[PDB]
Amino acid sequence: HEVYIKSTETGQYLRILPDGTVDGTRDRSDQHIQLQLSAESVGEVYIKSTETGQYLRILPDGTVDGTRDRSDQHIQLQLSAESVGEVYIKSTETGQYLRILPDGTVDGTRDRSDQHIQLQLSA
């Protein structure tokens, strides 16, 4: 099924744009917030846009973007649950958590105390 990832702090939905850009939006009508999960291996997943087919990617410098290169080795992500409906998205290769900032910016960060990394998963 398709899934929607939203910031529980800001209410912004994770959005993957066709030009490879990733940001946050509260526009529930936006088609590019529709995502889909798939397992690569035990404990790790791919997060794909259903509209564009890009994979969510977390680069070492903290940038978060999209790529259709399924072979890319920064698209391996970890969904860790913190309660029901509630998750963290971490890049196990870099150790960075996915972060959604209230200005709409989406990036990666390594500090677990960050107040913008707790996310909501709905299907």
Side-chain angles (χ1 to χ4, degrees), residues 17-35:
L17 295 172
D19 64 352
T21 295
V22 171
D23 64 355
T25 187
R26 299 186 176 90
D27 183 5
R28 294 173 68 102
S29 65
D30 189 82
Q31 292 294 93
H32 296 94
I33 64 171
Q34 297 174 336
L35 303 173

Side-chain angles (χ1 to χ4, degrees), residues 36-41 44-48 55 70 77:
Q36 199 171 14
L37 299 177
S38 67
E40 77 158 346
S41 67
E44 291 182 343
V45 297
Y46 297 138
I47 299 180
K48 181 197 289 181
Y55 296 95
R70 190 173 175 91
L77 301 178

Side-chain angles (χ1 to χ4, degrees), residues 29-97:
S29 65
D30 189 82
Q31 292 294 93
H32 296 94
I33 64 171
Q34 297 174 336
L35 303 173
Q36 199 171 14
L37 299 177
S38 67
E40 77 158 346
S41 67
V42 175
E44 291 182 343
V45 297
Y46 297 138
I47 299 180
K48 181 197 289 181
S49 169
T50 65
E51 284 292 321
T52 66
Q54 313 178 1
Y55 296 95
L56 183 61
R57 183 175 63 186
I58 302 183
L59 294 175
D61 62 353
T63 60
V64 171
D65 62 1
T67 185
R68 294 187 177 83
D69 185 4
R70 190 173 175 91
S71 73
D72 186 82
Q73 35 193 8
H74 294 96
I75 61 171
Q76 286 89 358
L77 301 178
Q78 195 186 19
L79 285 174
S80 68
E82 198 62 23
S83 72
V84 176
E86 298 303 308
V87 298
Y88 298 96
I89 298 176
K90 186 178 78 178
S91 166
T92 49
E93 287 86 1
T94 65
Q96 305 181 347
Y97 294 87

